[PDB]
Ligand binder design. Structure first.
Ligand SMILES: [Zn+2]
Ligand SMILES: [Zn+2]
Lengths: 340, 340
């Protein structure tokens, strides 16, 4: 199953489960990087290559709509649909040159955003019939606001449709129902019971104090999810569930270690990467002031041109470098560094 | 031939000549916008849609390499090759949602950059055998530094290869040879004589004072190119040649009008769009100072978060708006506005 470590580009099907299985066997998680442009995609691909690590690229509903541009009407999810498709084609085309396995993912999709999910699945199915692979490696459903029965049932419908393409499905379950502030292991296993007969290519993001009153992070309950599933399945697998860590910003190295030791394979990163991307472009035109105010600028008088300095290939690059540095911090924390 | 005006997305083959023929018949030129990212692509597509106008998107050797990221070694043109391919797939996927005809182009490619040209043609041929269309609508060769005989002969080889996919070829001719500061009409017609029997899908960018001593712009010689070709061809077509205007920044409205009246269909825009793209992002973090310096910021104390302000979907958008405004100025000048 270690054949995925030598794969180049976006992986699909059993290769996604092989990567997550290798993550569970070796005891590391992969950061899931929210991307909104070709520049943020490159920052993530470069960081994972320079650290010899796999990476997960994901577009949120707003991030995918940004790939299409805010000028596109998103009232019918059209911008999110067309933008995620366009982002998928870009990532599929450029990731092989970085020589790392890449999981192409989509982020939270609530019940109201299901037209976005339906549109992506439609493009996935058209691409699968042509090439034998879908566009995205995986999709995420966030029906945590709905009842646990309706959330799981709707997940069942889509997973039946996605399993035709061997597509991975991530689902989120909360504390809705149908302590009381954390998803109980019985509820998490109810997700496994409904999805496992369809396909093993699914992951679960449960509520365990990861706010995204003051509920503290309870990473120990993740190990309870695995022990409960293992006892109900009847196997020697200590980590039968693929768990996801949403909203991990601010957690200590100890909380991440216990979560990864409980079978967490994926840790979402968004806001922290957005700020890092800004600081590089922030530090550029700040320390290069009056070099960009006009096409006149400095060092001398009006005789000097500013084309060398306002070139977007120069200063947007500074945002990529600082974003890649922040992702490298996560690769070290999650032990993803130097796993390929 | 006016059927191209209702086309959505990237056009290929005879549709490119139909658009250029409609440009010559109606007397307008189309701006060629250099793009380096998904954000600059969106700025151009949105500007042309909002002005009901066709648009040309082009990647230079450096711009295509930027689509792959500076971290990718470009010593073998690999970054330029892989980046242009990835940019082509992104533009093909997202342009239909803007509802405008789009010409996908690549910019200057000198003799030393021919490995970049060969790599793109290879991907074009693989895509053409699969889908019946190449990736790019057109490519540009810049062998103006070579002798006119070697420039034209090398153009002949590639045009023979590109005509198999009905691909458009733009070539540049200068003052090399084999006044003396401007390309003579006989030299321009020598290009037509060698390329026309292969395919009519070619355009010529001649030297006429467009520096890119102090040679003044000589747009009148473009009308001399057309009259010389018409007399040698023996036809009633007053504009048998498709002409391109490189380095038009700083030209007056009168010089553009006389050039377009001489059959110019394409005016390159690069530096002016780079600066416009910066000013929006420049004006953002300038007028929003200390709102981005930390994840603490303002208006109040440390109690307030800055996530709403350093979100790249917010401030990079400001760069798209100012870039789209600059492109709209060119659409008005070149009379491309309100032609669809
Ligand atoms: Zn979540
Ligand atoms: Zn030129």
């Amino acid at each position: 199953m270690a054949e995925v470590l030598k794969k180049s580009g976006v992986i699909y099907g059993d290769d996604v489960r092989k990567l997550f299985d290798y993550a569970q066997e070796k005891g590391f998680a992969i950061p899931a990087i929210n991307v909104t442009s070709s520049s943020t995609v490159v920052a993530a691909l470069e960081s994972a290559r320079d650290n010899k690590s796999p990476i997960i690229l994901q577009t949120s509903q707003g991030g995918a709509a940004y790939f299409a541009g805010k000028g596109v009407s998103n009232s019918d999810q059209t911008a999110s649909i067309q933008g995620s498709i366009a982002a998928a084609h870009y990532i599929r085309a450029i990731s092989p040159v970085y020589g790392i396995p890449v999981i192409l993912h989509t982020d939270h999709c609530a019940k109201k955003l299901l037209p976005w999910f339906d549109g992506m699945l439609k493009a996935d199915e058209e691409f699968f019939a042509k090439t034998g692979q879908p566009l995205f490696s995986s999709h995420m459903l966030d029906l945590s606001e709905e009842t646990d029965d309706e959330n799981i049932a709707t997940c069942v419908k889509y997973f039946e449709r996605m399993s035709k393409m061997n597509q991975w499905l991530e689902m989120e379950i909360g504390i809705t129902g149908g302590e009381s502030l954390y998803t109980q292991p019985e509820t998490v296993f109810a997700v496994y019971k409904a999805l496992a007969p369809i396909s093993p290519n699914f992951s679960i993001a449960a509520a365990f104090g990861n706010v995204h009153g003051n509920v503290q992070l309870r990473p120990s309950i993740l190990g309870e999810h695995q022990k409960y599933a293992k006892e109900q399945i009847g196997t020697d697998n200590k980590k039968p569930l693929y768990l996801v860590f949403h909203g991990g910003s601010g957690s200590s190295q100890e909380e991440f270690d216990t979560a990864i030791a409980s079978g967490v394979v994926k840790v979402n990163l968004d806001t922290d990467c957005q700020y890092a991307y800004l600081t590089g472009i922030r530090d550029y035109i700040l320390n290069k002031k009056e070099y960009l105010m006009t096409p006149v600028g400095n060092p001398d008088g009006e005789d000097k041109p500013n084309k060398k300095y306002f070139d977007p290939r120069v200063w947007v690059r500074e945002g990529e470098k600082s974003m890649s540095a922040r992702i490298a911090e996560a690769l070290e924390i999650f032990h993803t560094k130097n796993q390929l």
